[PDB]
Amino acid sequence: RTADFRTLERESRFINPPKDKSAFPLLQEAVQPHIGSFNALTEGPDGGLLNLGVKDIGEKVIFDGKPLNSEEISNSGYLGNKLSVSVEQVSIAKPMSNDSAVERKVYPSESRQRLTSYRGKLLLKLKWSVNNGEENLFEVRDCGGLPVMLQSNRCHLNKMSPYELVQHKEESDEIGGYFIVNGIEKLIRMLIVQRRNHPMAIIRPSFANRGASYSHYGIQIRSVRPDQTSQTNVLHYLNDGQVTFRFSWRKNEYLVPVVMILKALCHTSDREIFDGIIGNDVKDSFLTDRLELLLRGFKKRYPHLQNRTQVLQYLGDKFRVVFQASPDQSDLEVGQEVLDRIVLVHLGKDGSQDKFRMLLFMIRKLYSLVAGECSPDNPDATQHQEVLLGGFLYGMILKEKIDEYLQNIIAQVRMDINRGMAINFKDKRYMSRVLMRVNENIGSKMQYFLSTGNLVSQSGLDLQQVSGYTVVAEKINFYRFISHFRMVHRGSFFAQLKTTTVRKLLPESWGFLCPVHTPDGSPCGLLNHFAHKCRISTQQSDVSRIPSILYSLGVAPASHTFAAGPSLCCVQIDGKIIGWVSHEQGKIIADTLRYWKVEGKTPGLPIDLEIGYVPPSTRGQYPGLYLFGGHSRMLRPVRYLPLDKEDIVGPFEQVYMNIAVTPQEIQNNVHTHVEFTPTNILSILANLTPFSDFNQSPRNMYQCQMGKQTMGTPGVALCHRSDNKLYRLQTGQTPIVKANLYDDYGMDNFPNGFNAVVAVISYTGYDMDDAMIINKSADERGFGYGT
């Protein structure tokens, strides 16, 4: 008959911490993008991001300064003995303490009390290959203590039930997601980054002021490797009618003609490039001239480059120094190495045909933007972005440090061969001598990142900023603490801009980014907080079975069709252009896919899949069927009207989707979905605010900041802590007036206030606008007392 508080249930759970599944699953679902992100570093298919990362950094070559002595012109060309060093596997151990002999388990409570770091032993199988594997030497090298995330894959608490956690001096429903570094709990802040594997048509005045006769128009795709490392490729339209390919290696930008990078990927004719960009719209005079400028320009500048091999050799010759790929690597090898490491890396190696098709599509999208056929894509909008999770960022910098680690081994060998010469690479003694003369403490390097937030890297990753990647998981009260793990920042670089569009609350954020929960002043609209039911993608699956479903639904293969433009629908799966269809059929496929998606009868179509359909419009967004399944995606649950079942929606696909708020507001022929509860669009703290639909907008916002600054309960396991400073309310009380989500997050474990007899009265004369009166006899009785 009511929406009561659990009193009998609460007190029983306080005495008896459950031995089964922990209560309040939403609390663990809040730290799901943090724990999940770090879990994918070792566990999951393909052996985790860290094993994929060392598989992508590859070998590091150095040659011995010794002759061949063969009975010859070979002697002069002989570089010596080859030494290719790499890392096959990467291991992480749960925190242990050795005393030199037998190891003992070290729990988080110990690390906090000891004022030390909760580190796990980092191991990595080093490969010492000589003369291209004529003799291989393996050694599992201990690379220091890597700080491990709490309640994760490599934490001692992940299996533990509420009872076990209390017996191990932790909170009954301990969330985790943070790192204990020198006694300080530090977390990796989530970042808003460009949506992976999608060509974005952007107008930027910045592009013009860089080079000669450069326009505002351009295309930008953020290609991501399976190890989560990113590599952005940019297309520029010059006023000459020339198209240039922009990229980054080390920390320098490089420009190459697009017709050169196209001919390097696969053997094609000039007409194959023509058919690839210009479809049946051959009569478009605007396109007819622009493409002639590209093809004739390439023929004028490079008349010698007449085949795929010559192009690769010319590319290899000019990039042999920057890519450091030398001195036995041919210009054909270096050329291909450039392509495999720079051009559309999301499609990866053995997918040059796929890279060629995607590149032609980017040129057509670029020409549609110049003409005006296509409106520019907004990077600041939620639809054209994803969320770089902490664990993924941690894995990226780890991959960077192991690349540095291999570079250091070569540096030691280069020092050795440039002086005393020492001995050969086949001797294990020499390997052991080199290895202990190299700084192998990657754990300290990773401990530095978690202790300063400063990004020290040779590439600088695909990020703009270099600081503030890590923040102290402030436990002044639980409300502030739980909000940290739901907080997302656009970037430190964006905070120093006169643009207000970035800070503006947009409709694209509906159900993903909370409209209330944002700070006042400088972090307003920059330091956002996600919705309580919003989730972030940890990996992808069944993605390989979807092209088979699409081709069967009438999708004509891109390799046979040869027709491109905004006049036809382009079908893509994680940036992989698979085919071509009509815009009429394009929606039919998009609607029928969603139907078999929610139905548990189809094995190859996952419910978490994003079906981004873009209908054709008059000077609107570039049309197509851009499907997504990959990591970092923003996802939220909604009720799908036919079948009456749950459906997962992304911010890209939502823009054209008609989702009613309440079931009574469903309009015929113009609605496909409905919300479960409108409370799904707000944060945890925003939902906790009583009758927020009766308060003025900035007061609801200020409450989030207030509840964060309140002297409440920072925890109950304080007698085993040693934090800088803690604020504890002695007499905590359960709210009579409360949202039911207060119980769903078990906020009664950490009371933030007290129920007081409040009279709206002007009586004393000391209370006026910003001043309020407290009762003396109440204060004397311990009301609002804190320590």
Binding site: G765, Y766, M768, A771
Partner: protein, 46 residues
């Protein structure tokens, strides 16, 4: 006005213009004796 040494030591010109300058920070404005600071509270009885 001196050659680069492998931040240099400030000269007497730098001492007079450290930030706002000696004239602005210690002549036009000064820290004073017989003064106090506190949070203000309202009172209708005074």
């Amino acid at each position: 006005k001196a050659q680069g040494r492998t931040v240099p030591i400030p000269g007497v010109k730098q001492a007079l213009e450290k930030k706002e300058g000696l004239f602005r920070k210690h002549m036009m404005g000064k820290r004073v004796n017989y003064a106090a600071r506190s949070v203000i509270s309202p009172d209708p009885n005074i």
